[PDB]
Amino acid sequence: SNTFIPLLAMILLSVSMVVGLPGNTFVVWSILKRMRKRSVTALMVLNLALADLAVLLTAPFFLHFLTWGTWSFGLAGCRLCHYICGVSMYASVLLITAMSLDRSLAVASPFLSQKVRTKTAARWLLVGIWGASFLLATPVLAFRKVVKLTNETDLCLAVYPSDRHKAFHLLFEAFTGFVVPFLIVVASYADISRRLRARGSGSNIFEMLRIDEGLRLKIYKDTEGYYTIGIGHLLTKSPSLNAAKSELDKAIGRNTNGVITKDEAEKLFNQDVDAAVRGILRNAKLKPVYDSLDAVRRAALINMVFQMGETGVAGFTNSLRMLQQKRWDEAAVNLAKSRWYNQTPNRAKRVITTFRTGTWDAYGSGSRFHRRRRTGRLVVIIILAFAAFWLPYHVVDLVEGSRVLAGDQSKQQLRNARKVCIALAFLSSSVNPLLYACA
Ligand SMILES: CC(C)(c1ccc(O)cc1)c1ccc(OCc2cccc(COc3ccc(C(=N)N)cc3)c2)cc1
């Protein structure tokens, strides 16, 4: 088994050359030669597919070192190749953090993105990522030097003066390289999938509310004589129009002069359910029942809460728990005697109908189907191919530093096992062009 690990590491590094060199050289080409307005999503890809190219430029050296038997490029060679390799890991993973940290701001509030996602404020970030990536790989050029092993064989690897030195740096490139990003991209990218559960899949929750609360695209006066716009979005508790009108422009970022788009009315409505669902989940009485209700019957809890406020809908306890206990017919007929049913029966006869049937049958037929998922669905695979390629390597870094404080011959497998994990990761630089050729 002494011969097959070098055999495995020399094909992957060569298939990464035959696939990663041409693809990245093309991907980096189009974004420069054949484009006028380079989108922000075309710069992330650019630098990410630009950095991935530099790592592969060092591959012909490790392959030579893999077969020749000794290093051949002097202190600079092995001081450099690891620095170039160490900077792409850092640059690549931070770009993937930013890309993933951003698709959580495009759903948290899509009106701030227009005022924050500026090509001038994206380019002036890349330098930051690059600069803050050029620095975090600096220990690798201080600790990796060539040592003459035999008259005819000088090997190169990290020379750590003490094992405490080795430990922390092996841990240091794990938290910062992977664990800090893996934790960040898990908070942001799971906040989203936990945000949409309130917002409901597709636009289905919106059109339901349009029929009910009325869709108006200009500032008007509410039922109680107060300024609102859209589906009940309260602009301000204030009398003045210019105060009310200006208050809106702050939350949209553009000079509306009193008018918003069908889109702007919908995004703004999501903030009206996003913030109306925390009130539910932070409410003593309607949190438990809501958690039990399926995706369909949830929007109607969001509907009544939109209607009368949580403090008000919290009153129908006996009709509340009957839902929680999954008995609809005894909650459908029980809600029939409320003043809410009497004062407004066109919207009560259908909200209640969505409970006992658990479908959108009472509201519409075939005008709600959308593909809410955006191009970030592609952005969510280039992080997984990345994570699946870089976890094998880092667990060893994580296990060496951990097991270098207590306890050779049992650990003689790690470097033999690290060799492939370290060499497997040479394919992540060659994974974007196939994902772009996935279509
Ligand atoms: C496998 C080989 C040739 C060897 C040699 C002697 C032997 O007996 C057995 C094996 C070897 C030697 C040294 C070595 O250290 C460099 C290294 C180690 C892990 C990782 C990277 C960067 O990878 C990246 C960085 C960034 C990206 C990116 N997406 N932008 C992709 C891949 C560099 C690596 C391999």
Side-chain angles (χ1 to χ4, degrees), residues 1-32 35 38-118 120-196 198-215 217 219-221 225 227-244 246-249 251-281 283-348 350-370 373-407 410 413-415 417-439:
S1 175
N2 263 27
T3 32
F4 113 106
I5 280 266
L7 170 275
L8 183 147
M10 69 191 276
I11 43 179
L12 307 188
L13 263 59
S14 66
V15 318
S16 276
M17 298 225 81
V18 161
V19 182
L21 291 178
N24 271 276
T25 332
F26 178 27
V27 172
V28 76
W29 175 27
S30 155
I31 309 201
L32 265 155
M35 296 216 322
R38 292 180 181 84
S39 191
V40 182
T41 323
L43 300 188
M44 304 298 189
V45 168
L46 181 68
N47 310 119
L48 152 60
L50 185 59
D52 291 359
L53 195 263
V55 154
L56 299 175
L57 280 184
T58 69
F61 296 166
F62 291 19
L63 281 186
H64 144 92
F65 175 45
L66 207 61
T67 71
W68 255 233
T70 187
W71 193 247
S72 317
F73 312 94
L75 198 87
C78 226
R79 216 162 159 254
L80 202 160
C81 284
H82 291 135
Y83 185 47
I84 267 37
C85 289
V87 128
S88 290
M89 172 188 66
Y90 267 87
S92 285
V93 74
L94 295 200
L95 302 183
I96 298 207
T97 330
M99 296 194 325
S100 166
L101 203 147
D102 161 84
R103 199 182 177 243
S104 187
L105 199 66
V107 336
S109 75
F111 296 131
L112 189 37
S113 289
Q114 264 107 359
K115 268 200 296 180
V116 118
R117 177 170 158 144
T118 317
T120 207
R123 259 136 122 76
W124 233 56
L125 164 138
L126 277 20
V127 165
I129 286 191
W130 283 105
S133 179
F134 273 161
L135 268 59
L136 277 38
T138 37
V140 190
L141 55 64
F143 291 61
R144 256 148 200 95
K145 299 175 290 85
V146 63
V147 289
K148 326 225 175 185
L149 194 90
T150 308
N151 255 39
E152 304 301 335
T153 286
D154 21 24
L155 294 202
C156 154
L157 195 47
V159 282
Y160 294 117
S162 188
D163 289 331
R164 287 305 214 85
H165 283 70
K166 171 157 187 155
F168 274 108
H169 182 263
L170 281 204
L171 263 36
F172 177 84
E173 72 174 346
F175 293 172
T176 314
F178 190 90
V179 155
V180 148
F182 192 65
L183 291 204
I184 288 192
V185 312
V186 146
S188 75
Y189 234 116
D191 152 278
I192 303 166
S193 298
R194 211 240 332 102
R195 207 140 265 252
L196 276 48
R199 287 178 184 177
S201 190
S203 228
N204 295 31
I205 203 269
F206 179 35
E207 315 239 313
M208 147 180 169
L209 255 290
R210 158 207 279 183
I211 293 185
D212 293 31
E213 290 265 324
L215 168 75
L217 312 187
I219 290 84
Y220 63 87
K221 284 203 173 295
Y227 279 84
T228 69
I229 184 206
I231 307 212
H233 182 65
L234 162 58
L235 293 206
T236 181
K237 280 199 165 310
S238 192
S240 184
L241 144 68
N242 51 310
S246 164
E247 232 299 331
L248 164 145
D249 290 322
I252 282 87
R254 75 177 179 86
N255 293 275
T256 68
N257 270 329
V259 63
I260 65 168
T261 327
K262 182 175 59 177
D263 297 9
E264 308 189 17
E266 178 169 33
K267 300 171 185 177
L268 227 182
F269 163 67
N270 287 337
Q271 278 70 311
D272 268 78
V273 45
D274 271 17
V277 105
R278 299 172 45 206
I280 300 182
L281 266 6
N283 205 266
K285 211 174 276 72
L286 34 150
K287 170 189 173 57
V289 35
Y290 175 14
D291 287 312
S292 52
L293 298 173
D294 47 33
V296 183
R297 297 175 178 91
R298 279 175 176 202
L301 217 317
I302 297 182
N303 210 0
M304 310 197 195
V305 165
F306 260 123
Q307 173 162 23
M308 14 196 187
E310 317 141 44
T311 66
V313 33
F316 323 160
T317 65
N318 278 79
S319 301
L320 236 328
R321 68 172 179 92
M322 280 167 166
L323 312 164
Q324 173 177 294
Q325 309 179 5
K326 313 255 172 38
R327 47 159 98 195
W328 309 275
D329 294 311
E330 294 174 49
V333 309
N334 187 274
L335 287 166
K337 322 182 190 175
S338 59
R339 290 162 194 86
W340 164 65
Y341 184 102
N342 291 348
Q343 310 310 73
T344 154
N346 287 327
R347 215 177 73 142
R350 302 196 310 278
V351 156
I352 293 168
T353 292
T354 55
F355 280 78
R356 27 166 299 110
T357 41
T359 59
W360 313 98
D361 277 329
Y363 268 64
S365 292
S367 62
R368 45 257 271 87
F369 286 62
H370 295 59
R373 46 219 194 179
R374 272 186 322 281
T375 197
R377 213 183 62 96
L378 153 138
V379 183
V380 84
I381 56 174
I382 91 174
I383 94 156
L384 296 189
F386 194 101
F389 282 5
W390 282 89
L391 191 58
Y393 166 57
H394 278 256
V395 153
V396 174
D397 285 353
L398 214 72
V399 97
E400 244 163 59
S402 65
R403 308 248 242 78
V404 78
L405 297 172
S410 51
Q413 158 71 326
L414 259 87
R415 191 85 230 286
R418 178 154 129 190
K419 273 170 193 183
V420 32
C421 306
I422 253 186
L424 203 205
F426 273 76
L427 277 53
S428 80
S429 170
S430 179
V431 85
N432 304 9
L434 288 208
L435 274 33
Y436 306 166
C438 177

